[PDB]
């Protein structure tokens with residue numbers, strides 16, 4: 001209930017998309033499943049391009065992996081961008097940084113609010129939120145409304161606080 | 172829908188359960204999407220265990236990745252399963268032997284003793300793909316002395332070969 005309750009004010013007619021992306025194995029499917037806002041439906045609109053969507057009324061959460069095109073069609077009604085990083089994966093945090101910056105430079109996403117989930121904080125030497133803020137260069141983002149939330153998606157810790165912040169921004 | 176028409180001999184009151192498994196990246200989600208038998212729904216029944224499901228009438232297609240142990244929740248799926256589809260990336264010579272081991276561990280599971288096995292040698296459009304005869308030997312299918320099995324070469328992205336294999340599977344499950 002608590003997640004559907006966050007979107008009560010955004011309920012309406014204009015369909016707004018929340019896009020949640022990050023490297024493979026960051027935790028994005030796990031997060032979608034923890035929202036309990038509807039079934040996770042997988043589509044393949046182009047060969048090689050797997051998309052996961054949960055449609056709750058006029059709000060859609062759309063997920064895909066970034067990291068080593070047709071994406072431009074999704075950006076139109078995208079009001080929020082959630083980037084999920086595996087805070088335990090130090091080998092690939094520089095690649096995450098490169099994919100985040102590549103998303104933020106899309107002109108079709110220039111007015112989008114950015115929520116960063118620093119996920120897998122339960123793991124013994126996960127990087128904390130301040131450290132991920134450094135590795136991702138978030139303080140260098142000067143004209144973006146952003147926020148970083150430390151999370152453990154398997155237990156749900158932090159998901160509500162992150163999404164509460166985001167819904168407030170889209171108000 | 173050709174695949175809907177193919178499966179019609181199987182429609183009834185009793186829930187037909189087809190399991191499609193394989194190593195990650197074998198092409199299983201692509202196959203499910205190509206069948207056009209309804210939406211692919213992902214659930215996570217237990218931590219770390221992503222299951223994809225397509226429900227067509229009384230027929231359910233369930234998918235998950237193997238590779239890396241048989242859990243008890245797996246055995247529960249096994250108990251109600253009539254067909255096992257094992258999908259192999261035919262171009263992944265590095266991991267074919269792991270695919271063999273995972274298929275053999277499943278087939279030794281007593282809950283699956285009566286299940287019909289269909290192997291998809293997928294990704295045949297790629298130039299170094301192992302053909303069906305080589306996958307047959309790599310996977311040890313001829314050493315299955317009590318199992319009803321069939322192997323079908325496929326290219327799941329074009330959708331070709333899938334009909335022939337499911338045709339065979341449906342006829343066995345009849």
Ligand SMILES: Nc1nc2c(ncn2[C@@H]2O[C@H](COP(=O)(O)OP(=O)(O)O)[C@@H](O)[C@H]2O)c(=O)[nH]1
Pocket residue numbers: 023024025026027028029030031119120121122123151152153154155218219220221
């Ligand atoms: N330890 C830990 N594992 C997680 C967490 N979130 C997700 N996972 C695991 O990471 C793996 C991949 O997660 P998944 O949601 O499929 O990632 P995706 O590829 O981004 O969709 C699974 O084994 C999940 O259980 C977390 O906060 N802590």
Ligand SMILES: Nc1nc2c(ncn2[C@@H]2O[C@H](COP(=O)(O)OP(=O)(O)O)[C@@H](O)[C@H]2O)c(=O)[nH]1
Pocket residue numbers: 047048049050193194195196197198199200201202293294295296297325326327328329
């Ligand atoms: N060349 C080729 N690629 C394929 C084929 N089938 C699937 N793929 C691709 O292999 C990758 C994994 O496919 P997917 O269905 O997600 O694999 P899964 O992890 O088993 O679900 C994707 O990039 C697919 O587009 C095929 O017959 N040929």
